[PDB]
Design an enzyme around this catalytic site. Sequence first.
Site, PDB file in Angstrom:
ATOM      1  N   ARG B  53       1.773  21.729 -33.700  1.00  0.00           N
ATOM      2  CA  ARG B  53       2.796  21.873 -32.642  1.00  0.00           C
ATOM      3  C   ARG B  53       2.561  20.901 -31.469  1.00  0.00           C
ATOM      4  O   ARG B  53       3.529  20.421 -30.860  1.00  0.00           O
ATOM      5  CB  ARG B  53       2.927  23.325 -32.122  1.00  0.00           C
ATOM      6  CG  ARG B  53       3.970  23.467 -30.966  1.00  0.00           C
ATOM      7  CD  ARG B  53       4.587  24.924 -30.875  1.00  0.00           C
ATOM      8  NE  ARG B  53       3.518  25.952 -30.952  1.00  0.00           N
ATOM      9  CZ  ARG B  53       2.560  26.097 -30.047  1.00  0.00           C
ATOM     10  NH1 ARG B  53       2.558  25.345 -28.953  1.00  0.00           N
ATOM     11  NH2 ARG B  53       1.613  27.015 -30.219  1.00  0.00           N
ATOM     12  N   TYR B 106      30.001  16.853 -28.999  1.00  0.00           N
ATOM     13  CA  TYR B 106      29.633  17.637 -30.140  1.00  0.00           C
ATOM     14  C   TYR B 106      29.713  19.151 -29.814  1.00  0.00           C
ATOM     15  O   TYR B 106      29.266  19.576 -28.736  1.00  0.00           O
ATOM     16  CB  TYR B 106      28.221  17.221 -30.572  1.00  0.00           C
ATOM     17  CG  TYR B 106      27.791  17.991 -31.762  1.00  0.00           C
ATOM     18  CD1 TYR B 106      28.353  17.753 -33.020  1.00  0.00           C
ATOM     19  CD2 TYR B 106      26.856  19.025 -31.630  1.00  0.00           C
ATOM     20  CE1 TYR B 106      27.953  18.521 -34.133  1.00  0.00           C
ATOM     21  CE2 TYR B 106      26.477  19.775 -32.705  1.00  0.00           C
ATOM     22  CZ  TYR B 106      27.021  19.541 -33.950  1.00  0.00           C
ATOM     23  OH  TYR B 106      26.577  20.313 -35.010  1.00  0.00           O
ATOM     24  N   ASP B 178      23.417  10.638 -25.763  1.00  0.00           N
ATOM     25  CA  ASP B 178      23.357  10.979 -27.188  1.00  0.00           C
ATOM     26  C   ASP B 178      24.051   9.838 -27.930  1.00  0.00           C
ATOM     27  O   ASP B 178      25.289   9.677 -27.814  1.00  0.00           O
ATOM     28  CB  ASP B 178      24.127  12.298 -27.422  1.00  0.00           C
ATOM     29  CG  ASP B 178      24.142  12.714 -28.883  1.00  0.00           C
ATOM     30  OD1 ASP B 178      23.756  11.912 -29.780  1.00  0.00           O
ATOM     31  OD2 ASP B 178      24.557  13.866 -29.122  1.00  0.00           O
ATOM     32  N   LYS B 203      21.816  12.725 -39.037  1.00  0.00           N
ATOM     33  CA  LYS B 203      22.995  11.883 -39.325  1.00  0.00           C
ATOM     34  C   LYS B 203      22.516  10.507 -39.817  1.00  0.00           C
ATOM     35  O   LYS B 203      21.809  10.463 -40.839  1.00  0.00           O
ATOM     36  CB  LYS B 203      23.966  11.869 -38.119  1.00  0.00           C
ATOM     37  CG  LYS B 203      24.254  13.258 -37.464  1.00  0.00           C
ATOM     38  CD  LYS B 203      24.959  14.221 -38.345  1.00  0.00           C
ATOM     39  CE  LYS B 203      25.230  15.619 -37.690  1.00  0.00           C
ATOM     40  NZ  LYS B 203      25.913  15.637 -36.312  1.00  0.00           N
TER      41      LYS B 203
END
Lengths: 386, 387, 387, 384
Positions: B53, B106, B178, B203
Site C-alpha cells: 500500500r 465524466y 483530466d 481507457k
Amino acid sequence: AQDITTTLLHPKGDHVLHSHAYPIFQTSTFCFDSTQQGADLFMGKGEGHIYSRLGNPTVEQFEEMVCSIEGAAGSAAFGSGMGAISSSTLAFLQKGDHLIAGDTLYGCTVSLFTHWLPRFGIEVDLIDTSDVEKVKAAWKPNTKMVYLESPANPTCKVSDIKGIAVVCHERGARLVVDATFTSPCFLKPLELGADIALHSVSKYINGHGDVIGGVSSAKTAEDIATIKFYRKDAGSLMAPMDAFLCARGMKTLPIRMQIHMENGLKVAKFLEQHEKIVKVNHPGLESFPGHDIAKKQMTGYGSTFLFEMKSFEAAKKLMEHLKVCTLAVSLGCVDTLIEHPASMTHAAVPENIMRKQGITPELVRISVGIENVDDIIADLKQALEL
Amino acid sequence: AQDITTTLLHPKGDHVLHSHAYPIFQTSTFCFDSTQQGADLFMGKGEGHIYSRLGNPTVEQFEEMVCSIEGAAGSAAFGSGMGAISSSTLAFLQKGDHLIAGDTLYGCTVSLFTHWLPRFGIEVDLIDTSDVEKVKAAWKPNTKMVYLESPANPTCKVSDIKGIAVVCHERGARLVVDATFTSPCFLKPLELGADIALHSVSKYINGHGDVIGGVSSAKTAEDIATIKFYRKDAGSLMAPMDAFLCARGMKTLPIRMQIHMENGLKVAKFLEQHEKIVKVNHPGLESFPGHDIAKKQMTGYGSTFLFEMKSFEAAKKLMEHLKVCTLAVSLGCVDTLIEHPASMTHAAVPENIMRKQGITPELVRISVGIENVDDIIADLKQALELW
Amino acid sequence: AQDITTTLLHPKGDHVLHSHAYPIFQTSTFCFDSTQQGADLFMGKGEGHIYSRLGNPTVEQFEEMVCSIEGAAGSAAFGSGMGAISSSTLAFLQKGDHLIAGDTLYGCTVSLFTHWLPRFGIEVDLIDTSDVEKVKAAWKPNTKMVYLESPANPTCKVSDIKGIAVVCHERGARLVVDATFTSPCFLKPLELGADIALHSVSKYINGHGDVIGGVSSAKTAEDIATIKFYRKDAGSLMAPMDAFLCARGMKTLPIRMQIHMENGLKVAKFLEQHEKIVKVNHPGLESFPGHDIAKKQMTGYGSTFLFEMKSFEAAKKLMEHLKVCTLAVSLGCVDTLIEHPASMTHAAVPENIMRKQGITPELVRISVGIENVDDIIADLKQALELW
Amino acid sequence: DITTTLLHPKGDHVLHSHAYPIFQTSTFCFDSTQQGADLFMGKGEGHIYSRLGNPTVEQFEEMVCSIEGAAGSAAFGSGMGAISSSTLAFLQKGDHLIAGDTLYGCTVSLFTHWLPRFGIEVDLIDTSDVEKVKAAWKPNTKMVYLESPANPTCKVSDIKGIAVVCHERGARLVVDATFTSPCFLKPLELGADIALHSVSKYINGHGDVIGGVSSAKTAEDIATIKFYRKDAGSLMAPMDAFLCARGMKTLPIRMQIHMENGLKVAKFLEQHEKIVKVNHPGLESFPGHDIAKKQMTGYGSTFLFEMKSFEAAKKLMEHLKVCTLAVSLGCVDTLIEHPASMTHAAVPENIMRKQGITPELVRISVGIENVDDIIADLKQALEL
C-alpha cells in the site's frame, strides 16, 4: 446446519461455461444486447453487468463468500482495508457530524480519523472504548457513529461491542467494527448488534501474504448500497486477479484460523511463563483484562498479539536473532511475522495518542503462523537465550 | 531528443534478478534486515520497501513510465480513474474551500463533485470552462482549485487550458486536468500550466479493455507526496497484476494513439459528409467550435467523439446493426465501441446539468479503435444504409 | 475482404457473461450436467469442455486467432515453441521413418532432431534446403517428412518452400514449416504448400517478451486432431494466463510487424553501408542470396537478422556499448535485443553443423524492436564510432 | 514438521519481497558477452531464458525436491509432461518397459500408442505381485513404471520389493505418487529412482492449475529429465508455479483432512446396503492394505466403490447437492465421476477387463468440507 467449511467451498451462483473454478474476469467493460438492455441495466432493471468499477463477476463471487460468513445483507470488496475503512465511514459521515472511535487503532486508521476527517468538518473523539460508560460520557447530540477495533491493533485491548451496540441502537448512531484481528470465523460483529463489519482482507482472510484488499459488510440493504455508491466515486476496487486469489485463500480460512488460534495461544503461554517476558497481551489468556468479554463475544481468537521485554535492547536482540520468524509488518499470513510497533507500525501515531495507547519501545508484536508451533517456540527459545 | 516510443520501451531502473520483463510483485509485505533498517524506512531514510500500500515495485515501474511522458515531479497509480480523481481533489480541498469545475464532465466525476464534496463542506460550482470570462466571474476569495476535462466526455467541448492556468497561477488556485480522452501522447497539461494531470488508465493508456486503473501526476514533489499520503489512507491502489498489464499496454501507446488519431479523423469525416448525420463533434474538424484551441494546445486528438443522428430511432437502428463496432460503455480500447450517452453513460447526470451539457437522445458516441479504417467505415455505412 | 487487423480484434465466438475481454479460465476441470452429458463429451458428442489439458476456453480463443491468420483447419497452442515442434514432428514420425530437415535451424530444434529422434528409430538427415536438388538427392523410399525454417535462425538462409512442397506432395511426405522469424503476417506456409505451419509464440506473436509458448496449425482436420492427440499425452500446454497474454499481444501483431519490418530494413541498410560492417544477412536486402525467393514467397520480413563484424573483439565492443539495445537471447520483442550466436544461441550446435551453418565469432544477431528507428540507429552508430 | 519446511523454503528474498515474485518474462539480460557465454557453459550463477530456467518455477521445484528427498525436481505444464519426460528421457528403440496394468487413462494412451511407435516394447502386467514382474523380465528390460495405489481402483503394488528387483537387474523404477501426495508416499525413500505427480491434483489442491513435477534420486537423472524438457517443451508457466507454490503452503494441513474425511466416507459407504464394495487402501477389507500401511504414512482421499447396477450409479451421481460431477481429483471440494464412461472410456477393451473396470463403479475424490456434510449428501442421494 451446513458447516462454514462447506459453505465457503460451495458458494451460491451458476458455473460459468461449466468451469469448476470461477473464471477471472479480467475485463473493464461488458457488451449490451441492445440499447434497451443497456439502458435497463443503468436503471437497475434486469440482471447483468456494465463495467467493472460498478460490478465485476469475480469480485462479486468473493463478496458473496464474505457476505455468507458475516450473515450480512451484502458485502463490498476494495483495493485495501483502508479503502473499506474510508468507505464505511465517509459514506455516512458529513460536515457537522461527530464520530467516537477507539483510542487504540491500526496506524493508518488513526491517520484517517485524525488528519482527513476533520478537514471534512467531521468532529472526532478518540476515547477508551473498553469502558461503555466512557462512550456514554463522550456522546453528543450530533454523534452519528461509533467505530471500534476489538481486540485492538496492536495491544489487543478489548471493547464490549455488544453493550456499545445497545447504546448505539438507543441513541441513533451506526456501529462500525473492524474485525481484521480475529477473522469472521471467530468474530461476527453483525451478530453482536453492529451495523457494519469490515476487514483488511490483506491479513487472515486471504492469509497468503500476496494480496492487499478490504471488505465491508452491512446489516441493511440500504447501507451496503450507500457503501457501494461511495466506492463508485472514491474508486478503491479489488482487482479481478486479487479477488480470484482472495476467494482461493478463503477456501482454507476455517482450517487456517483453527491452527492460528491454537498455535498463538500455545506461543503466548510459553512467553507468559518465560523469565524474560514482562507480560503477554493475548485476549485468550486468563490474566488478560477483558478476557471474560472476549470469550463471551467471540468464538475463537486471532494469533496476533504483543508482549513486553525488560528493555528496548532486549527486544532488538530477540527480533534480530530469529531464524524462522520474519521481521516485517503486516499480520495473519501463513508464516510467522514479528515487528516493533513503537518504531514501525505505530511510529506515526501522534505522541498524545501514543501515550493513551500504551505503546512503548519495550513491546514486540508477533503474528503466529501455521508452522509446527514447536518450531516457533524453539525459534523464540533459541533467541531468548544470549 | 529520444522519441517517446523509445523512452516507454526503455524505462529507468535496474532489472530485478536480470529479468528482461519487470517482475510482478504479488506480495503484501516486505522483509527488514534489522530493527534499524525497518525503523529508517518508516522515517523515509534509505532505499527499500515496507508494504505494498505504501509502495510496490511493479506499481512504481508503471508510475515512472507515466511520470516520464507527463514531464512530472512524480506519478501515483490507483485502482481506478475515480481513485485518481478523488485523490487529486480531496487530498487538497477542505471544508471552506471552493472548487470551480467544468459543466461537462465524466458522469461519476459529476457524482463525486455534486454529491460527496458538498457533504465535506467544500463549495462547488460547475461552470462553462470553454469561456475564460465565465471562470473569472465564478471566482471567489476562497477558490482553491479549478478542475478541467478537455475535450470533455462525451461532447468534446474544448476549454482554454493555458488561459485558465494563468488565472489559477495569479490567484493561488491549483489547476487539475483530466486528459483521459486524449492520452499523454497528445495532451500534456503540465506543459500548459496545470499543476496536476490525471487519467483513467482504464481507457487509452492501458488500451486493451482488460484493466480498471487511474494515475495522477504532479508538477511538484510536495503535491505528489500529498496525493500519495491521501492514497495511503483512502486506499485506492493499483494491484500488482494490473500494473504489470498497464505497463505492458503502455509499451504500444504511441503507435496505438497514432492509428486511433488517424482512424478517428477519417471516421469523423465520413460521418460529417453522410446524409443521415446532422453534426459531428470531433475537435479535429474545422467545423468544430474550439478546434483552434485544441489544435494549438494538443499535438493530436483521441478517437472518441460524438455525432448527432436525425432521431432517437435512427440512433438505435445504427447502434444495433453494427458487426465490427461493439455496443458497450468505456472507450480507448484497441477495438471500436459505441454507446448512447442519453440512456447509458450520462443517464445518471441530473437534468439541470444534462441540458447545459447538451446531451440529447439523438447523440451517439463512438470510440474508434485500431481496426482497418475502411472496415470500420464499411460497417457504419452498411448500417446507415439499412432498409 | 476484411483486413487482418480487424479479424484479430474481432475473433469468432460468443462473449462469456457479456464480458468484453475474454475471461481467463484458470481452472483444471469442468462440471457435467449429467452422466450422459459427460459420457457424450468423452465420445466427442455435443458441445462443451471436460478438463483443461483436453481443452481450455481461453487457450481455444488464442488457437482460433492463429488459425484465422494461417488459413488452417485448426490450431493447437503449447507451453513453448519446442512443444509445438516436438508435437508437429513426433505426432507423425515413427520408427523406420525418415526426416529431411534444414541444416540451419534453431539450436534446440537441432538438439531434438539429432539427439532424441534417432533414439526413437527415426532416421534424420540435415540438408542444405536452399537447394531443391539437394533435397531430392537426400530422398529415400521411407522419407515421410521435410521440416524447414525459412529464413533460418540465425543466418536468414532462404529455402524454396513452394518448390520443396511440390516434391513432398508428389511423394507423400508432410511439409512442416517453422515461420517464427517472419510471423504469420508475412509468411503463410499453408498458402505455399506446407501441411503444418508453426511458431514460437514467445517471439513476435506475443511480442512483449513475457510469455513462452508455441502454436502449430494444420491444413487438415485429421492432422490437427493427431497433433492434439499427441499433446494430450506429451503434455506441453499453454497456461490460461499465458493464453490471455498471447491473445492480448496478438491484438497488435499487424501494426507491430509493420514497424518491425520497416525498422529492420532501415537498420540493415545503415549497417550495410557502415565501414565497420563486413556483410549484412537480411533477406530483404538486394545483396542477399535468395532475396528473390523471399520476396516472392513472403509479403514482408521480420526484423531479426545477422551481420558480420571484422573480428570477435569488434563484435564484443559493439555489443557491450549499447544503450537502447539489450544484450540477451530471444527475439521479436517490442524492444531491441542483441546477442552473439557463436558463444550464446548457437554454442550448443555440434561443431560439424556449426561450419555447415556458417556461424563464426565475428557474427552478431540483432532483433530490431519498435523504438523510433533513428534512436536505434544512433545507438548503433555511437558504439561503432567508439574510441 | 513438513508445514514449517514448505513455509520457509531456502533462498534469498527478491528485493526484500515477502512473497516470491512472479517472473512473467521470457528472457534475461546479460552484463557482458563473457557473462552470457559463461551461463551457456553452465559457469556462474544466473538465468538465460525461461524454458531453461525461470526463478518462480525453480522455487516451486525446490519445495517439491525438499519434500521428496530428491537430488532435484523438474516442473512441467501437466502431469502428462512429467510422465512422458520421466520415461522417454531414458527409454529408446530396443528397450523394454514393464508398467502396472491399471494406470491413469492418458498414461495407458502414452504407453500403448506412442512408446511402441518409438520402438519401445511395453508389457502392462499386474504389479501387485512381484513374481509376475520377475516373470515378465527380459534381457532388455530398462524400466518398471508403477502407480500405487492405482487410478482408479486403488490397486496396491509392493514398491519396495520391486525396487529391489530393479536395483538387482539394472532397471530404473519410476513411481506416479499422484494419488497419495508426497506427504504420505515418498517413493525415493522406498528405493525408486524417480517420483512424479500430477500437481493438478493434491499438490496444488485448488482446482485451478494443470501442472506436473518429477523428482530424481540422482543429479544425473534430473539433468537428463531437464534436458529432455528443454526439447520436448512441457513447461510450468510462471503464474502457475506461483499458484502451485501457494497451494502447497497448505498441502500438509489439507492432506490430514483429506485422509481423515476419505476414511470416514469409505467406512460409511462400506456398511451401506446400497454399496457392494469399497476400494480404499486404508480399509481392513482391501487386498494389499498391509503393504500400503507399511509403505505409506497416510492415504489420499480418492477411491472407488461398486453400486448394484449402472442405473443405481447414475441415480447416485446425478442427485448429489454438494459433491460435483466432474473428472479430476484432489481438489479442496468433493468430486465424483464414472470411470467406465469418463476417465477410463478410452482404455483398450483388453486392458480394461484386466483393470476390472465395470459400469457399476463410481470414483469419489473426498474434499476438505465437513465430513458430516459430505456423508449427508451421499446419504440423501442413495436413499431418496
